[PDB]
């Protein structure tokens, strides 16, 4: 068990992206995929959803980011995952295979 993560590299190229990522990612549409990766908490899971409207979208993924960070690469491959399953062509984009 390792104290702290490097993966500070991993979502600041992320943030290269965020621009379009909290754009097109639907964060509380994929809450119950999140939390089966265990990646993403049960209060900030009521904290997404808190937003029917998700007008505040493009604040919401940007924040969901943030938190996914403290779970190391785990949230970084399970949120690669939620692009190959959703948005292939925003996926293709992101890791850049
Ligand atoms: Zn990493």
Redo the contacts with the bound molecule.
């Keep these: 068990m390792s104290d702290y993560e490097?993966?500070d590299?991993?979502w600041s190229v992320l943030e290269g992206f965020r621009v379009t990522l909290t754009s097109v990612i639907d964060p509380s549409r994929i809450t119950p995929y999140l939390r089966q990766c265990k990646v993403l908490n049960p209060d900030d899971e009521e904290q997404v959803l808190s937003d029917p409207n998700l007008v505040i979208r493009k604040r919401k993924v940007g924040v969901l980011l943030d938190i996914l960070q403290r779970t190391?690469?785990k949230g970084?491959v399970a949120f690669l995952e939620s692009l190959e399953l959703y948005y292939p062509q925003l996926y293709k984009k992101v890791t850049g295979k």
């Design positions: 490097n993966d590299e991993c190391g690469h970084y």
